[PDB]
């Protein structure tokens, strides 16, 4: 019947479902409201993976538990796919795994998933290739929107609370500045607030981007004390249940990210 495929977190799920389409029941292991950077599967989740037909993960530098799991899998039926393949990676903040925030790299991940599924299930190669080709067409339009909207950036540097955008920066000619010690929910101390205010002023920072909407308390404090606005650059590591309700997907969230980023890069 239908292939049973287990994927780790949202972009791996989305790219795999786009390629597999109706040939497969694609399960999302790390769902909405859980952090993929900290997740590790329980024994029952591990058993689910081992008896799947296919398991897709993004990269061992993201799902750092996958290397230990791979050693058990030769006595198990599941065939595995590393979505990033042999893509070379940037150094970590020990390599940076966040390649899917660059549309041109997302195309490469889709192509690799297509080719791996095609090699594992030759009788479905026609379907994998036609599903992948239609989605890659959509990713190419996203890539063009990014290239057109960011290539003439007057302001090349952008400040983010989650450092997921180094490949976006590399591939589209920008500079990610990561800031730690802020959470979308935090109320920073007076001393922390003063550090941010000095940085914001001496570098003319217009926005701080968060992985989800800053709390109304944090946004008001940053405006009144630091003179900086806030917005969202979503690393697409897990959709909120809100976003899942509204039908957001990789491309729509990437379009929202572009719009938010241009508030900085267009000056
Ligand atoms: Zn991340």
Author numbering: 27 to 119, 136 to 309
Give the exact sentences the study uses for this entry.
The AdcAC domain is linked to the N-terminal cluster A-I domain of AdcA (residues 1 to 311, henceforth referred to as AdcAN) by an 11-amino-acid linking region. Collectively, our data show that the AdcAN domain is necessary and sufficient for Zn2+ acquisition, with the AdcAC domain and the His-rich loop aiding in Zn2+ recruitment during growth under Zn2+-restricted conditions.
The AdcAN domain has a two-lobed organization, with the N- and C-terminal (α/β)4 lobes bisected by a cleft in which the metal binds. The binding site in AdcAN is comprised of three Nε2 atoms from His63, His140, and His204 and one Oε2 atom from Glu279. These four residues bind a single Zn2+ ion via 4-coordinate geometry, with bond distances of 1.98 to 2.08 Å. The partial opening of the Zn2+-binding site of the AdcAN domain arises from the α7β6 loop having moved away from the binding site due to rigid-body rotational movements of α7 in a plane perpendicular to the helical hinge interlobe helix α5. The high-resolution crystal structure of Zn2+-bound truncated AdcAN did not reveal any conformational differences by comparison with the N-terminal domain of the full-length, wild-type protein. This permits the bioinorganic chemistry of the site to be tightly defined and likely aids in achieving selectivity for Zn2+ over other metal ions.
